[PDB]
Design a protein around this ligand. Structure first.
Ligand SMILES: C=C1C[C@@]23CC[C@H]4[C@@](C)(CCC[C@@]4(C)C(=O)O[C@@H]4O[C@H](CO)[C@@H](O)[C@H](O)[C@H]4O)[C@@H]2CC[C@]1(O[C@@H]1O[C@H](CO[C@@H]2O[C@H](CO)[C@@H](O)[C@H](O)[C@H]2O)[C@@H](O)[C@H](O)[C@H]1O[C@@H]1O[C@H](CO)[C@@H](O)[C@H](O)[C@H]1O)C3
Ligand SMILES: O=c1ccn([C@@H]2O[C@H](COP(=O)(O)OP(=O)(O)O)[C@@H](O)[C@H]2O)c(=O)[nH]1
Length: 407
């Protein structure tokens, strides 16, 4: 088959879509990976053996006054500048005509579109190509969308209405409580393509990255890795509470931190924090090799925002989770793993959802420091790792997904 894949302009979408493209090409399918040029330029390289089977189709983002040239992804357009989020949405929707032109002559068997691709779904209908909508999260999250407790909701609803199939990233082995209960979303069949845990070969990072050389100098399971994915906002006041919570709990840490918009370098972290913690902690204000870090012997707990990629990556390497969900599917993901006893959420105010250094330190202590509770979280995370890291199981689910596309 020729499968056209259209990821949302966000690294939590681009990365698993690139892995799915290579899983399809590995089984002898042709893939057109449709995105914007700077986003494509920032992706890990395709395996040389698959080079002719994964075609990158670069559609330039239209120019929108006030949207920087090159600001193509949610990693570039900050959530703390909602006016720019809106300009990026307008630019994204401007891809409609170039995409429809491409699809007309593509000889596509399937279009697989992401959560806001209402125009790509419209093009699939126009060109009589079946359309699958990606909702590459947990079964628990898909259940939440079915029973929740243009606007974003309208963009999603319209994309779903024009699709024939909804694609989740889980399996009955991981969510036996939920997967058997799900049949349809807006009357469209739900299919699960497994957890699709990533591969080092697919995420080609540097094993000589400064963060990995620092981890090399720390003893086994001694380091709390801290990362909140590629896009969620965390304002400077919240950065300081997270910093001081890490300091007070006293563990070694490696922290991949994105800067809030318009915050000075001198203001980013608490006064003297970097000096006081220099001996036990590293803050990297750049993209880090997360797969190399989570695969590293020095990492024990993972302080995660519970993005679905990070949840799967943490558990595939048997890390218990210290969970700080920010938006979207992160709350449901955090509650799902808490219910599996493999991590604990940082306390949040029942009112404004705020956290402080005491809540951060208490969660770190419970998961990573206190002998008895940390031992149990570690054992429970290892039980989940048995399911998450079963690569043969998740490859069988990809085969099943391809059979669904045929049927
Ligand atoms: C009904 C809904 C289900 C929902 C679940 C999460 C989901 C959706 C966003 C669809 C795409 C996948 C996914 C997993 C996601 O987070 O992707 C993720 O979506 C992100 C964008 O959110 C992307 O960037 C990521 O790449 C992507 O993975 C999905 C659709 C909209 C959602 O609800 C809407 O959440 C907005 C959040 O905004 C977000 O709020 C954040 C603060 O919390 C801001 O930082 C952020 O800029 C803003 O977009 C909020 O501002 C609106 O008020 C609210 O809509 C209102 O909901 C009410 C209750 O259901 C209704 O009664 C109202 O009629 C309805 O208008 C949220
Ligand atoms: O410094 C970073 C930050 C993130 N990631 C990767 O970016 C993805 C983040 O996706 P997730 O669903 O966890 O969160 P999102 O960014 O969508 O909020 C994961 O595959 C991470 O491995 C990375 O490699 N380095």
């Amino acid at each position: 088959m020729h499968v056209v894949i259209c990821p949302w302009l966000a690294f939590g979408h681009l990365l698993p879509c690139l892995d799915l493209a290579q899983r399809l090409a590995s089984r002898g399918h042709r893939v057109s990976f449709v995105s914007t040029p700077r986003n494509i330029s920032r992706l890990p390289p395709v395996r040389p053996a698959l080079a002719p089977l994964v075609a990158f189709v670069a559609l330039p983002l239209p120019r929108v006054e006030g949207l920087p040239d090159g600001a193509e992804s949610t990693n570039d357009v900050p959530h703390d500048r909602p006016d720019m989020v809106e300009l990026h949405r307008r630019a994204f929707d401007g891809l409609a005509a170039p995409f429809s032109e491409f699809l007309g002559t593509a000889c596509a068997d399937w279009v697989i579109v992401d959560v806001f691709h209402h125009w790509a779904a419209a093009a699939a209908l126009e060109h009589k190509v079946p359309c699958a909508m990606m909702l590459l999260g947990s079964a628990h999250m898909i259940a939440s969308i079915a029973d929740r407790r243009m606007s974003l909701a309208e963009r999603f609803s319209l994309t779903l209405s024009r699709s024939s199939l909804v694609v989740g990233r889980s399996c009955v082995e991981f969510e036996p409580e939920t997967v058997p209960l799900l049949s349809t979303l807006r009357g469209k069949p739900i299919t699960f393509l497994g957890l699709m845990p990533p591969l080092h070969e697919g995420r080609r990072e540097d094993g000589e990255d400064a963060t990995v050389r620092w981890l090399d100098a720390q003893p086994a399971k001694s380091v709390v890795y801290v990362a909140l994915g590629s896009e969620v906002p965390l304002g400077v006041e919240k950065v300081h509470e997270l910093a001081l919570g890490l300091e007070l709990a006293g563990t070694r840490f490696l922290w991949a931190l994105r800067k809030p918009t318009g915050v000075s370098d001198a203001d980013l972290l608490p006064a003297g924090f970097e000096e006081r913690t220099r001996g036990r902690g590293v803050v990297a204000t750049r993209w880090v090799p997360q797969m190399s870090i989570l695969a590293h012997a020095a990492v024990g707990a993972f302080l995660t925002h519970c993005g679905w990629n990070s949840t799967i990556e943490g558990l595939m390497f048997g890390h218990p989770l210290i969970m700080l969900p920010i938006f979207g599917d992160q709350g449901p993901n955090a509650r799902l793993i808490e219910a599996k006893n493999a991590g604990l959420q940082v306390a949040r105010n029942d009112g404004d959802g705020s956290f402080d250094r005491e809540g951060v330190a208490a969660a770190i202590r419970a998961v990573a420091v206190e002998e008895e509770s940390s031992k149990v979280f570690q054992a429970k995370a290892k039980k989940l790792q048995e399911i998450v890291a079963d690569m043969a199981c998740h490859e069988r689910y990809i085969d099943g997904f391809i059979q669904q596309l045929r049927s």
